[PDB]
């Protein structure tokens, strides 16, 4: 249960290397966008999901790269690719631990 | 050194 600071970038209605590419197409059209408002939202990682929830046994992969920022990838379920944006790559990569025990956790 | 990097689900 740690909590994190990111900014939101949008949601649509076989490795982590194709869901990077999925963002790169839906941003280079527009239906998400690159750069977002600068509002800082909390992002916490409990047992109970990603606290707007998001489950822990439906959640199949986290991705995260560099676009000095970075992004954020998640796969919840049809299914979603949920994106947001870390403020640097470390924290991005912080959040991937706090996933690898809390998967653990069940 | 790492790059990208992921969690996969069992």
Same mark, same amino acid.
């Given at each position: 249960?740690? %909590?994190?600071?990111?900014? &939101? /970038?949008?949601?649509?209605?076989?490795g982590p290397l194709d @869901?990077?590419? &999925?963002?790169?197409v839906a941003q280079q059209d527009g239906k998400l966008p690159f750069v977002p408002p600068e509002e800082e939202f909390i992002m916490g990682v409990s047992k109970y999901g990603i606290k707007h929830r998001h489950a822990l046994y439906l959640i199949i992969r986290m991705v995260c790269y560099d676009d000095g920022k970075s992004l954020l990838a998640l796969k919840t379920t049809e299914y979603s690719l949920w994106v947001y944006?870390?403020?640097? @790559? %470390? !924290?991005? !990569?912080?959040?991937?631990? /706090?996933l690898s025990t809390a998967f653990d956790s069940v | 050194k790492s790059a990208?990097?992921?969690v996969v689900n069992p």
């Open positions: 249960c740690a %909590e994190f600071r990111i900014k &939101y /970038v949008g949601a649509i209605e076989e @869901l990077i590419n &999925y963002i790169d944006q870390c403020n640097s @790559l %470390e !924290q991005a !990569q912080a959040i991937c631990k /706090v | 990208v990097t992921t």
